[model samples]
Target: GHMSGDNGGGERRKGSVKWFDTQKGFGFITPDDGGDDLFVHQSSIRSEGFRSLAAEEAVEFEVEIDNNNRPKAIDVSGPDGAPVQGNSGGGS
Candidate 1:
């Protein structure tokens, strides 16, 4: 739960990629504390030309409600506000 951000009205929440689709450019993140699954879009992901989240990708981000008043994960970034990796962005 060591995540934070200035989301809708400066609200920071912690969660991870429950499932994301690089092709679809959309997915969801299950909040660590449990609530509604935040809807995440590839465009919202922090990546340079490449935006995709690995399965169960841990991240912290801001949120905003949609027209339906649903939590949507926008301005998402890796843990500790690190950059979100792309296809080329690596891990050993």
Candidate 2:
């Protein structure tokens, strides 16, 4: 019987915003497929005006290993390539 072991990288993966700090400008996302949370930075978000991810917000992004060998999220965006709903906590 043929069995599959562990899978490798994938295309734009779907996940949800575990938590994001508008102040810190970073957060974590839980992949839908199940795995360790991935680091997500505000800069990674693909949007204009402001770049931020809301709590538990559905998002799609690509995963890449950092120099430290840690998983990080890149090219993050809202589900279906939509713009993420960024909540402007306040102004500087």
Candidate 3:
């Protein structure tokens, strides 16, 4: 019964993000709960080799907690976590 409440494991607020907003500094995240997506902020994004996201582009971000116990984004990047290239398919 102790694990029922006051348990960090209980809805720890962990999931993935889908839509991201760079200008507004926030975005919508698709929940793994098989439901709908949630809102995310740019500050939530970590400071490492973070890549810039394009409009309507999909990204893989993790939902975790900050020092204040607020949900934050750990890593933000393309779906494959690799450098996503936008090919205009034009010749120089």
Candidate 4:
């Protein structure tokens, strides 16, 4: 008998936040798998309170092609599904 295996698809991927603007609510992520930076929106983050990403913060997310055929990040979260650390929502 022969068996077939399915390739890894739609699985969450790991990456680091290149930079995110809390005021702007968007940024780019550097994928660990090696590719063009993925565009990330604050709305795509899965967390409580303010949804924003810290610079170079490690994160996991799934990629999806936008209407412009650009790679965009969705369902973004911290490593191990922890809450993402943002620069806002706290006193200096």
Predicted structure with the largest lDDT when compared to the true one: 1
Candidates arranged by TM-score, highest first = 1, 2, 4, 3
- Cα lDDT of model 4 by residue, 1-92, tens digit: 54333223334677888988876767988888748788887876764456777777888888766779787776778766554445234443
Clashing pairs for model 2 are: none
Q: Write the per-residue lDDT of candidate 1 for residues 1-92, one digit (tens) a residue.
A: 64444432636777888898877767998777558889887776766568767677888777676777787886678856776456246783
| Displacement of the residue 84 alpha carbon in candidate 1, Å | 3.4
Better of 3 and 4 by TM-score: 4
Models 1 onward score TM values of 0.70, 0.69, 0.42, 0.68
**What C-alpha lDDT, on a 0 to 100 scale, does residue 39 get in candidate 4?**
85
Q: Cα lDDT of all candidates, in order?
A: 0.73, 0.73, 0.48, 0.72
After TM-score superposition, the amount by which residue 43's alpha carbon in candidate 1 deviates from its true location, in angstroms, is: 1.4
RMSD in angstroms between candidate 2 and the native structure over all alpha carbons: 8.1
Clashing pairs in 3: none
Please write out the lDDT profile of model 2 over residues 10-61, one tens digit for every residue.
2467788899887776799897865878888777676544777787888888
Q: Please report the candidate that would top TM-score against the real structure.
A: 1
Better of 1 and 4 by lDDT: 1
